[PDB]
C-alpha cells in the first residue's frame with residue numbers, strides 16, 4: 001500500500017526513538033491544546049474506525065528503514081562458517097532498508113544495513129557521589145526519524161499534520177507519499193507496538209503498567225485495541241499497523 | 251529393588267567389566283570378568299543386589315540365563331523372572347544406542363590426536379591437558395579398581411550414590427580402547443542407564459523400541475538471563491541473583507526427573523541455564539511435561555514479570571536417531587533447537603491471561619541446599635516447585651533431595667536423601683571482614699589507576715563443535731569436560747595454579763596469594779569476572795592459555811575487557827564488555843578486546859587483537875619500558891613523555907592512515923614504528939604504529 005511518511009528532521013539530539021503509543025500520546029496532547037477534547041474524541045474515533053500510525057523508524061538521506069519482521073528468525077536456513085556467522089548478525093538486526101524489508105516479507109533472501117544512521121551515545125555525569133547515564137540519540141548528516149500514517153487525508157490534514165507542527169515549534173516536520181509492496185496473506189507484521197486482542201503468532205514482549213507486542217511481531221487478523229483509563233481521561237494507543245507477511249511452515 | 255532402580259543401576263554397571271579386565275584380575279573377557287567382580291563384591295559385605303546386578307556384564311535361546319536368573323531367587327527383591335529378562339535385554343540394546351590394545355588411554359574429544367594421562371577427576375589437583383599418547387600402566391587400573399571396590403562396598407546402591415564414585419574414577423578412562431576414542435567410560439555408563447530407564451517407562455522383552463519414536467529429547471533454556479542478572483537498581487546481590495538462577499534451574503530439572511520417574515543419569519547436561527534430558531515418549535510423560543512447563547512459566551511471570559522466561563520443548567525420537575547412518579542425532583538436536591527458537595519468539599504464550607530482595611540479600615560457610623516443600627521452616631528461597639533450606643556445616647540437611655556444592659562425596663547426609671552434586675565457580679576475594687569484596691575494595695587494590703576490571707569471555711562456535719557429536723555419549727563427554735573447565739578449573743586458574751602450563755602472560759604485578767578477583771558467573775562456555783583491573787587484565791591471558799591446553803589448541807576463546815570507575819553501575823559495565831566481546835567475536839574470534847581504542851572507520855582496522863598478536867607485542871615492548879609492580883624503567887622516569895608522544899603520533903595515523911606525516915615526526919627505543927612498513931600497505935593491513943597503544947595505554951595505567 002501507499003502511506004504518508006511523517007519525516008521528523010531533528011534540530012538537536014533525541015532522548016528516545018518514539019514508538020506508536022508515545023507518538024499517539026504526544027499527538028493526543030497537542031490536539032487537546034489546539035482544539036480541546038472534542039477533537040481528541042474525533043481522533044480516537046478515526047483510529048478506532050481504521051486510521052493507523054506506525055512507530056518511528058530511522059531514515060538516512062533518501063533511505064527509509066523498517067523493523068525486521070520476526071517472521072524470518074525461524075526461516076534463516078532458507079559455507080557452514082559463513083552460515084553461522086552471518087545468521088547471528090541478521091538475528092541482532094533491528095532494521096532493514098525498504099527494499100530488503102519487502103524481500104523479508106516474501107521469505108526471499110535479503111541483506112542488512114551495514115551502518116545504521118544513529119549511534120546511542122549515553123553520557124555519564126557524577127551526582128552529589130555516583131555515576132548516572134542519560135541515553136541520547138545522535139543523527140548522521142540528513143538523517144532522522146519518521147512514522148507512517150494510513151487513513152483518510154481529512155483526518156491527516158485536520159489532526160495529525162497540525163499536531164506534528166505544534167510538537168516541533170526540537171524538530172521540523174515534512175511529509176512524502178511512501179509505497180511498501182507487501183504480499184497478500186492471512187498473516188501480517190505490526191509496524192507499531194500493540195495491545196493484542198488475540199494471542200499472536202511470533203512476538204517480543206515490551207513492558208511499560210501495560211504489556212505491548214513489539215514492532216516486527218506477527219499476528220493473524222488482530223486489529224489490536226485502544227484503552228481509556230482515569231488518573232487525573234487518557235487513551236493508550238495499541239492498534240496494529242499490518243503489512244502482509246509470508247510465514248514458513250513449522 | 252524394583253525394575254526401575256534395577257534397569258538404572260544395571261545400565262550403569264553393564265560395562266564395569268572394562269576397568270577390571272584392564273587390571274590383571276579375572277583372566278577373562280570384560281563381560282565375564284565384570285560378572286566375577288560384582289559377584290565377588292556381593293559375597294563380600296553381603297549385599298545380594300550386586301549378584302543380581304552381576305548378570306548385566308554377561309548377556310547375548312538364553313537357556314542358561316533363564317536358569318542362572320532362577321538360582322538367584324528374584325521374589326527375594328520383589329521382582330518377577332520375566333521382569334529381569336526385560337531389564338537385561340533393555341540394557342543390552344541401551345548399551346548399543348549410547349555407543350584394540352587394553353593400555354590405550356582416553357583420547358581428548360577436543361583433539362582426538364592427543365590423550366589424557368590417567369587421573370581421578372579432582373578440581374584441586376592438576377588441570378587435565380591432552381598431551382602425547384602414553385599407554386596406561388596396568389598398576390594404575392589396579393589402583394583404580396581397588397578404591398572403586400572400597401567405594402561400592404560403602405555406597406547405598408542408589409544411582410545417586412553410584413554415579414558420583416563412577417565419575418570420580420572412570421571420567422579419564424576410554425569407554426572402548428581403539429585409536430582416537432573420544433568417549434569417557436563414566437559418560438557411556440550414565441547414558442546407557444539413561445536410555446535403558448527411558449525404554450522401560452516406554453513399555454518395551456523386545457527391533458520395536460529401536461525403529462519407533464519411544465524416546466523424548468527434552469531441551470530447556472532460560473531466556474532473559476542477561477537482563478535478570480545485570481539490570482539491577484552491588485556485587486553481593488549480583489552473586490545472589492546468579493546463585494538463585496542455578497537453584498531455579500535445578501528445581502525445574504529435578505521436578506522433570508521426579509515426575510517422569512527418571513534418574514540424574516537422564517540429565518545429558520545442565521550448564522548456563524541450558525538443560526537436556528533423554529526420557530520416555532508415553533502420553534503420561536508429555537502431559538506431565540506440559541503441566542511442569544506451564545506451572546514453571548506461570549511462577550516466573552508472577553515472580554519477575556517478563557524479565558526471566560523458560561523455553562521448554564521436547565521431540566519424539568527413535569533409537570535410530572541416537573546414531574549415525576551414511577548423522578541423525580545432530581539432525582534431531584537441530585530440529586529441537588528450531589522448536590526452542592520458535593518457543594523463545596512466543597515468550598509466556600503458555601499464559602492466556604497475558605493479553606487483557608531481603609531473601610537474596612541474605613543469600614560463605616554453607617555446604618548446599620535441601621529441596622523441601624515451599625511451606626517448610628528455614629526455607630531461605632523458593633523456586634517454581636520447592637523451597638530451598640540452606641545446609642550449613644554444623645547442621646543437619648532437610649529434604650527429599652540435598653543439592654551439595656563442589657564435591658562428588660555425599661558426606662554426612664541421611665541415607666534416604668537423594669545426593670545432587672552441583673559445581674559452581676564461586677571464587678571471591680575475602681575482605682577484612684569475612685564477607686565478599688565490594689567493587690570499591692577490588693578497585694582500591696589495583697596497581698596504578700583505581701579502576702574495577704571486568705571481563706566477559708565465551709568459547710567460539712561451540713554450537714558448531716557440539717553439532718559434530720555422533721552419539722548421546724560423545725555429546726555427554728564434550729558437554730561435561732567443557733562445563734567443568736569453567737565450573738571447576740577457573741578457581742584454580744585464579745589461585746595461581748598451572749604455572750608451567752600457562753607460562754609467561756602479559757602482567758603488571760607479581761600474582762597475589764589471595765587475588766583481588768570475584769567470579770559473578772563461570773559456566774557452559776563463558777564467564778563474567780570482576781576485580782582489580784591489572785589482575786583482571788592478566789587473568790584473561792591465564793584463562794585463554796589454560797583453555798588452549800585443555801582443548802588441544804583446537805578450540806578458541808574471545809574476551810571483552812573493561813576498566814571502569816568503581817562507581818559505574820553494573821548494567822553499563824555489563825553492556826560495554828558485552829559490546830566488546832561481540833566485537834572480538836565479529837572481527838574473527840580467537841581475539842581479545844584489551845582496551846578502548848581510536849581507529850580509522852575504513853573497515854581495515856580491527857579494535858580486537860588475536861591473542862598471539864597481543865602476546866607478541868607485550869613480549870616486544872613491555873620489557874623495554876616497564877620494570878614491574880607499578881614502576882616504569884629507570885631510563886624512562888624523566889622521559890615518560892616519549893610514551894605519550896608515540897600515542898599523539900598514532901592519532902595522526904588515525905586522523906588519516908594515508909597522510910604520511912607520522913614518518914616526519916619520528917628513536918632507538920621503538921625501531922619497528924619509525925619506518926613505513928610496505929608488506930602491511932600491500933597486504934591491505936594496518937601499520938605497526940596502529941597496534942602499540944594496546945601495550946602503552948596498559949603500562950601508563952599501571953604507572954599513575
Ligand SMILES: Nc1ncnc2c1ncn2[C@@H]1O[C@H](COP(=O)(O)OP(=O)(O)NP(=O)(O)O)[C@@H](O)[C@H]1O
Nearest residue numbers: 472473474475476479492495496522523771774776
Ligand atoms: N546463573 C547465571 N549467572 C550468570 N550468567 C548466567 C547464568 N546462567 C547462564 N548465564 C549466562 O547467560 C547468558 C545467556 O543470556 P540470555 O539472556 O539467555 O541470552 P542468550 O543465551 O543469547 N539467548 P536468549 O534467550 O535469546 O536471550 C550466557 O552467557 C550464559 O552463560
Ligand SMILES: Nc1ncnc2c1ncn2[C@@H]1O[C@H](COP(=O)(O)OP(=O)(O)NP(=O)(O)O)[C@@H](O)[C@H]1O
Nearest residue numbers: 519521524708709710711712713729732733774775
Ligand atoms: N557445556 C555446555 N554443554 C552444553 N551446551 C552448552 C555448554 N556451554 C554452552 N552451551 C550451549 O551452547 C550453545 C551455543 O553457545 P553460545 O555461547 O550461545 O554460542 P556459540 O555457539 O559458542 N558461538 P559464539 O559464542 O557466537 O562464538 C548455547 O545454547 C549454550 O547454552
Ligand SMILES: [Mn+2]
Nearest residue numbers: 472473474475
Ligand atoms: Mn539464553
Ligand SMILES: [Mn+2]
Nearest residue numbers: 708709710712
Ligand atoms: Mn560461545
Ligand SMILES: [Mn+2]
Nearest residue numbers: 708774775776
Ligand atoms: Mn556462551
